[PDB]
Amino acid sequence: ASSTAHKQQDINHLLDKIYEDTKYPDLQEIAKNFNPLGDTSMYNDQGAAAEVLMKELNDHRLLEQHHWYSLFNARQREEALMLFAVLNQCKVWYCFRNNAAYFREQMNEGEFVYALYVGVIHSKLGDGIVLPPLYEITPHMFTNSEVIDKAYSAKMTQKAGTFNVSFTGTKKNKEQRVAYFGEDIGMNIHHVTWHMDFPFWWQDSYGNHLDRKGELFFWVHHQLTARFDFERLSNWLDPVDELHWDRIIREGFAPLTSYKYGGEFPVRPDNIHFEDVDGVAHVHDMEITENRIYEAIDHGYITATDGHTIDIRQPKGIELLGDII
Amino acid sequence: ESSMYSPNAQYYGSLHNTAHVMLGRQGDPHGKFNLPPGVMEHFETATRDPSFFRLHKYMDNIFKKHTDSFPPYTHDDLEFAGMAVDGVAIDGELITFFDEFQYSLINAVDSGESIEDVEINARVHRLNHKEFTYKITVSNSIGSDHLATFRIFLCPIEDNNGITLTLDKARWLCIELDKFFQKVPSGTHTIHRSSKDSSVTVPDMPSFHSLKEQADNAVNGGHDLDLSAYERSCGIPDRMLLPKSKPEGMEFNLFVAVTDGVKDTEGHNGDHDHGGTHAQCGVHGEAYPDNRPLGYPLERRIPDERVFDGVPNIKHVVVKIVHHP
Ligand SMILES: *[C@@H]1O[C@H](CO)[C@@H](O)[C@H](O)[C@H]1NC(C)=O
Ligand SMILES: [Cu+2]
Numbered sequence A: 001a002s003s004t005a006h007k008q009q010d011i012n013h014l015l016d017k018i019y020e021d022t023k024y025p026d027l028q029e030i031a032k033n034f035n036p037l038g039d040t041s042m043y044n045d046q047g048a049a050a051e052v053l054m055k056e057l058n059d060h061r062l063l064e065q066h067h068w069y070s071l072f073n074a075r076q077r078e079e080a081l082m083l084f085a086v087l088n089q090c091k092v093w094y095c096f097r098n099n100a101a102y103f104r105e106q107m108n109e110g111e112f113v114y115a116l117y118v119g120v121i122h123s124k125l126g127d128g129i130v131l132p133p134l135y136e137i138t139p140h141m142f143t144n145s146e147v148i149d150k151a152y153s154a155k156m157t158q159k160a161g162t163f164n165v166s167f168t169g170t171k172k173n174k175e176q177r178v179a180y181f182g183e184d185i186g187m188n189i190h191h192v193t194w195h196m197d198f199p200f201w202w203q204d205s206y207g208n209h210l211d212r213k214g215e216l217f218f219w220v221h222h223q224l225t226a227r228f229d230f231e232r233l234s235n236w237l238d239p240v241d242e243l244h245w246d247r248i249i250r251e252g253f254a255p256l257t258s259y260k261y262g263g264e265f266p267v268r269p270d271n272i273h274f275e276d277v278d279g280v281a282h283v284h285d286m287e288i289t290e291n292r293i294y295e296a297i298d299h300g301y302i303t304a305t306d307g308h309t310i311d312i313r314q315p316k317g318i319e320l321l322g323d324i325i
Numbered sequence B: 001e002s003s004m005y006s007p008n009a010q011y012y013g014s015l016h017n018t019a020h021v022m023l024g025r026q027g028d029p030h031g032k033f034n035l036p037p038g039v040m041e042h043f044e045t046a047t048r049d050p051s052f053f054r055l056h057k058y059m060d061n062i063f064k065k066h067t068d069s070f071p072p073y074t075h076d077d078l079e080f081a082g083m084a085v086d087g088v089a090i091d092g093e094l095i096t097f098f099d100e101f102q103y104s105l106i107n108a109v110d111s112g113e114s115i116e117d118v119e120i121n122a123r124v125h126r127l128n129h130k131e132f133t134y135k136i137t138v139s140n141s142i143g144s145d146h147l148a149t150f151r152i153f154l155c156p157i158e159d160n161n162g163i164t165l166t167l168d169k170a171r172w173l174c175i176e177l178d179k180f181f182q183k184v185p186s187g188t189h190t191i192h193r194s195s196k197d198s199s200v201t202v203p204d205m206p207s208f209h210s211l212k213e214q215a216d217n218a219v220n221g222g223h224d225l226d227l228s229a230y231e232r233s234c235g236i237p238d239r240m241l242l243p244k245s246k247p248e249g250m251e252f253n254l255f256v257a258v259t260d261g262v263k264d265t266e267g268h269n270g271d272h273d274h275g276g277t278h279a280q281c282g283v284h285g286e287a288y289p290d291n292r293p294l295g296y297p298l299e300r301r302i303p304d305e306r307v308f309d310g311v312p313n314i315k316h317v318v319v320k321i322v323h324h325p
């Protein structure tokens, strides 16, 4: 039951038709009858993570199904990580599979998919599993709205079809010349998977340290930026400018993409100044934060909570900067 | 500035020198037009540009926040015990005018192979003033002769709107006219000081032609060359000692502070030769001969003019300067 074949099959089934109740009777039975609190010896933490999540569920404090999910939303992330924490404590596959089946039917689908992916990646139980490409598990997040609408039409008419995607914007938009870079479905999987492998929410109490993570954070994004500029150079364009909090964002964007639940992704006009975002930050807060990071760089040390100096004039300095940035 | 004496250029950078370049390049800030550096990017030319003085007032105000942070001087801080300035007077009228000055342009033109030079000169109108003599009557009621520092400033009485300035509002606008060290004998004596001897100023430079003539005559005749009567080129030009003023005349405060020369010159000898330009240009190859803060005693806030008026070794008098057009 812990064989790679069965674990892979289990994961395939859990991720199938993710917006609907599971169509697999064996997963249905588990979701109905399994008790995450029913055997604390299943877990390396004596059952604590399961208690934490079940209390949120039983108190009706979890995000509803059929709702957008953003990893950058603090509360939604906290909920996804409560399920990750349970999966991460399972000693044996049946604990992992049964909790995943149980919470698939109780939790928001975006949170569930996120937690299951990082759970597989960061548990030794996940070794050998190949995660399906997210562009087939949640295609809305990788497919423009026009093609999704054709897929909806194919389903409404019960007729199979294959539909061509053809990049956002018009030829009048010079930025479209390089749309094949950032819209490539594999480039997007690269990016999501890097962050799943090296999550900003990681704590070593989850089981292990992620070596040089802050420096790898700098490097992977430096390479994304440098690779994009090489596409611009290939297409008779100048390099990208850098963002400034007090200057206009020249290039707007119309995603022409939609959530499965939540509506169309919002458009940004050309040539707009940053505005304060209610519930997030003031633009001035971003400037102050930037200033404080540059203060550390130019001091050669990061300032600890009690004021003492943390030396960054050494090879680990770039990593510590990644940690704080 | 910053200089190589800065303890931390990585953090504090180089505000003033970088500002020269920032301002100098505002005619072509991105290098699109292939323009050469601005006049602000050479000390030969920087003061030609009006913005020089706006930039340097900006910098001056940074220094001023530091100098304003100290406690105002007290009576006991300022009093040179037993030394009274009884009177301050000037022998001769304070008169400015413009006269003519010539210099050679030969080095600027291109000389042909085996064709003869021709004399090519520029004639400029320059500010100048007539010679005058300070007459400072001091009473030394200490039981012995004492070294004194004579500090002489010119201060505005009213601004361009005809508003009378307080001492605190005048002090940062005062210009240094002289500083010299002289033994004051016991009793009452009038000290005489020629305008030509100011430690703030130096004469017009000797011409290139004159230096060639003198060096050639000495080398060709086997004579020793003695140029020791020539002064340094650092220092306000003698001719610009006084402000232009107006044809109708303008009144100014002539401020004289007589301070304890034994204290001011301690470690630098009050008999030794300090050269002709020590007020702002120091002494070639030697330590700076006046231990007091630059600008003493005007470099701290004076919120209460009564403090200065009660110090016998400080006195100011009204003088008139007339421009002859
Ligand atoms: C979609 O692309 C394929 C191959 O590029 C082509 O044969 C087909 O005609 C295209 N369909 C449409 C509607 O353009
Ligand atoms: Cu990223």
Ligand SMILES: [Cu+2]
Pocket (backbone or CB within 6 Å): B016, B020, B056
């Ligand atoms: Cu300067």
Ligand SMILES: [Mg+2]
Pocket (backbone or CB within 6 Å): A019, A020, A021, A022, A065, A105
């Ligand atoms: Mg459901």
Ligand SMILES: [Mg+2]
Pocket (backbone or CB within 6 Å): A281, A285, A286, A289
């Ligand atoms: Mg912030």
Ligand SMILES: [Mg+2]
Pocket (backbone or CB within 6 Å): B196, B197, B198, B199, B200, B201, B202, B203, B231, B276, B277
């Ligand atoms: Mg002199």
Ligand SMILES: [Mg+2]
Pocket (backbone or CB within 6 Å): B074, B075, B306, B307, B308, B309, B310, B311
């Ligand atoms: Mg007094």
Ligand SMILES: [O]
Pocket (backbone or CB within 6 Å): B046
């Ligand atoms: O300067």
Ligand SMILES: [O]
Pocket (backbone or CB within 6 Å): none
């Ligand atoms: O300067």
